[PDB]
Write a protein that binds this DNA or RNA. Structure first.
Ligand code: SF4
Lengths: 50, 172, 98, 50, 49
DNA sequence: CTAATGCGAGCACTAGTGCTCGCATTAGATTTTGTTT
């Protein structure tokens, strides 16, 4: 997914990445998406909660 | 090296002014107060203040930060009182101390090299401030270090204060 | 994360301990060693697992015998050096036999 | 701009979460203590007694 | 004056100070209008997430 | 986080000298819970 989004190169994606990652890599955004998803899975309607 | 070869390499014998670390990174500022652009630029600038060791002299300090008139430096871990004397927060030492350290260093190299040629390959991991070399070491499965085993134990190193360390170096 | 160190001390004092643990397996030396064997079988051209197996009780090569293997070929992979030692060594050597 | 600071909802959630967490830890302790039939031992560690 | 009591009252008062300064830095180093502005500014980023 | 360190300022007492006040920075500190067969 991440590679696909970097390929699109949409301004918004870079806007998000820049904010929730370090100056060297993007692993923190990876952990963020994992975490948000996992949390949303405890709702009867995950996508609505998101 | 730089001091020992200064005369030959440069032209004149020199004096240790210090050793400094520069943190290469693109910092992020976490401020509770709203900052104007100039203030932000100042905070970013501050994030690059160099740690390390200095020579405890007002002149050396002023040569490292010609901006500093009074107070704390934003470039080095030094500061000048209203007096104009060095702040005691400053990370500095005297001449004797710098030379003391460098001598200790060469001692370390001599002894180590000696033991290396002596064929010393013993498994002796240190432990200091809960930090071990093992965490970053690729050879954990080669050494097969087992603390539960008798004859396998860490080397406890006491994290002493600078004054204590230099004290040891002098007495040794 | 406190449980293992508790178990070790209570076991050290004759007190039987049970605990369903979910961590610590891969830092056990036997596991590192057996795994190393499996890796070497998958691909011997991994210096660290090979050296691990050689130094383990599985083979019992000591530090001298290890550096001795290295001397046959310094630049190549450790496996290459081992093969070379075999190629040159005489069957009367203990190291050769290992 | 290279600046970051908590928004109001972040602080709000941090406060909320702290008291929710403490509340639960309390309950956790209750479960622990109520497991015992006849004997209870409470063991802890600190730097200095006095 | 009991020495311990003097110090005890001092401690409590300083406690009050700390509580207020924590309150101030938490909520009132920025105007409410500024808080709302920063918040609203963050909206597009959240949508991408 | 929090605790200590130091430096400088002021406010108050009986102009200097005490001590509260404030700011700014290191130093040390800390080490997840469950869901299948
Ligand atoms: S891992 Fe084995 S080799 Fe690497 S440091 Fe710890 S003990 Fe020495």
């Amino acid at each position: 997914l991440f590679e696909d989004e970097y390929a699109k190169g949409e301004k918004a994606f870079f806007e998000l990445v820049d904010r929730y990652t370090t100056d060297r890599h993007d692993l923190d955004l990876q952990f963020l998406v994992k975490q948000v998803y996992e949390y949303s899975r405890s709702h009867p309607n995950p996508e609505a909660w998101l | 090296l730089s001091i020992t070869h200064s005369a030959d390499w440069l032209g004149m014998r020199a004096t240790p002014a210090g050793v400094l670390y520069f943190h290469i990174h693109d910092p992020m500022i976490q401020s509770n107060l709203p900052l104007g652009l100039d203030e932000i630029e100042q905070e970013i600038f501050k994030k690059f203040k160099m740690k390390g060791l200095l020579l405890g002299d007002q002149e050396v300090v002023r040569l490292m930060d010609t901006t500093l008139q009074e107070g704390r430096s934003n470039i080095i871990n030094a500061g000048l009182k209203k007096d104009g004397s060095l702040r005691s927060d400053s990370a500095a030492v005297g001449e004797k101390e710098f030379d003391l350290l460098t001598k200790h260093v060469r001692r370390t190299f001599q002894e180590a090299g000696e033991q290396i040629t002596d064929g010393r390959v013993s498994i002796e991991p240190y432990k200091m401030k809960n930090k071990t070399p093992c965490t970053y070491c690729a050879f954990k499965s080669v050494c097969q270090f087992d603390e539960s085993l008798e004859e396998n134990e860490y080397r406890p190193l006491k994290a002493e204060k600078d004054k204590t360390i230099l004290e040891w170096i002098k007495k040794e | 994360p406190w449980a293992p160190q508790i178990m070790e001390e209570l076991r050290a004092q004759g007190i039987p301990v049970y605990a369903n643990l979910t961590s610590g397996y891969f830092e056990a030396v036997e596991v590192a060693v057996a795994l190393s064997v499996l890796k070497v079988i998958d691909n011997p051209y991994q210096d660290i697992p090979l050296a691990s197996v050689l130094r383990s009780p599985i083979v019992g090569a000591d530090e001298n015998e290890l550096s001795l293997i290295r001397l046959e070929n310094k630049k190549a992979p450790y496996y290459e050096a081992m093969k070379d030692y075999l190629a040159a060594g005489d069957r009367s050597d203990e190291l050769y036999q290992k | 701009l290279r600046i970051s600071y908590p928004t109001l909802p972040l602080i709000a959630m941090k406060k909320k979460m702290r008291r929710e967490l403490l509340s639960e830890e309390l309950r956790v302790l209750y479960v622990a203590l109520t497991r015992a039939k006849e004997k209870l031992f409470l063991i802890g560690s600190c730097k200095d007694h006095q | 004056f009991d020495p311990a009591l003097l110090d005890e009252a001092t401690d409590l008062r300083n406690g009050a100070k700390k509580l207020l300064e924590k309150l101030k830095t938490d909520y009132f180093t920025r105007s409410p209008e500024q808080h709302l502005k920063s918040l609203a500014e963050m909206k597009p980023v959240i949508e991408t997430l």
